[PDB]
């Protein structure tokens, strides 16, 4: 199937409490594989998946150097953005950045990403063409002008089309035991009385990977979109994910209800019913 690699970065200033905190993580698909935290005692890029541990010390030294450099540029940028937005040095502010690539089954680039936010709002993003920018406001237009002058987009495109794809391919092969295995959901339907006249039907999906999943309730073949409580897909803590969908049903009409489960680890989409 298709796959992705992403790096996420967050810098958060804390006036009066030292330099900004910097945290960056790397993922392949829904699997965390590297992290760096500026507040660690001896901050280094660290492995978080077994298949990356085999990379040699040259790899780890270089990835550490890149993270530390990003921490520094972010510190500088937080100061710059105070100027761009006419803000005081008193408050905490946040810079976020994500970049990476999606590849298809054949391993070719499907799409590249590089986008930034300040204080939780879009700041500047590389467009899908990997050659132009979208700036959210007049401050971000200053950055856009700088990055156009430094030919940032051309270098980013080179990375996204080159190393990003190539190393994603490398990781997928080295980690094929896990990265290329889908774990289907373990499913069940539970019944929870509310009152005389109604009860909750809850459809469970447990232990699945990757996170992408569709859980829907139907009443006599009709989608109960408006009346379904759907919790956010949540991590179990052991690579896998969990989710549930619930409907409130008039007691007696339970059999008019079926839960449907779609997951890439499922050959046929599943159909579940409540059973006492």
């Amino acid at each position: 199937g298709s796959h992705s690699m992403r790096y996420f970065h967050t810098s958060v200033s804390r006036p009066g409490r030292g330099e900004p905190r910097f945290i960056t993580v790397g993922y392949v698909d829904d699997t965390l594989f590297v992290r760096f935290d500026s507040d660690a005692a001896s901050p280094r890029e660290e492995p978080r998946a077994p298949w990356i541990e085999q990379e040699g010390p040259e790899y780890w030294d270089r990835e550490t150097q890149i993270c530390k450099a990003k921490a520094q540029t972010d510190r500088e940028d937080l100061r710059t953005l105070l100027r761009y937005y006419n803000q005081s040095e008193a408050g905490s502010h946040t810079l976020q950045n994500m970049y990476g690539c999606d590849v298809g089954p054949d391993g070719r680039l499907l799409r590249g990403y590089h986008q930034d936010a300040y204080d939780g709002k879009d700041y500047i993003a590389l467009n899908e063409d990997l050659s132009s920018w979208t700036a959210a406001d007049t401050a971000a237009q200053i950055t856009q002008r700088k990055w156009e002058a430094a030919r940032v987009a051309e270098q980013l495109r080179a990375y996204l089309e080159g190393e990003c794809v190539e190393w994603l391919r490398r990781y997928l092969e080295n980690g094929k035991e896990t990265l290329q295995r889908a774990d289907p959901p373990k499913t069940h339907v539970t019944h929870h009385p509310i009152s005389d006249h109604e009860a909750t039907l809850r459809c469970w999906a447990l232990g699945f990977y990757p996170a992408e999943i569709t859980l829907t309730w139907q009443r006599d073949g009709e989608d109960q979109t408006q009346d379904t409580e759907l919790v956010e897909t949540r991590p179990a803590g052991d690579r896998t994910f969990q989710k549930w969908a619930a409907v409130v049903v008039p007691s007696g009409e339970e059999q008019r209800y079926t839960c449907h489960v779609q997951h890439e680890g499922l050959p046929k989409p599943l159909t579940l019913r409540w059973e006492p």
Binding site: I66, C67, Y99, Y159, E163, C164
Partner: peptide
């Protein structure tokens, strides 16, 4: 594998 670029500032 992270992207390397030099003194990229906003």
């Amino acid at each position: 594998k992270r992207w390397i670029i030099m003194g990229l500032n906003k």
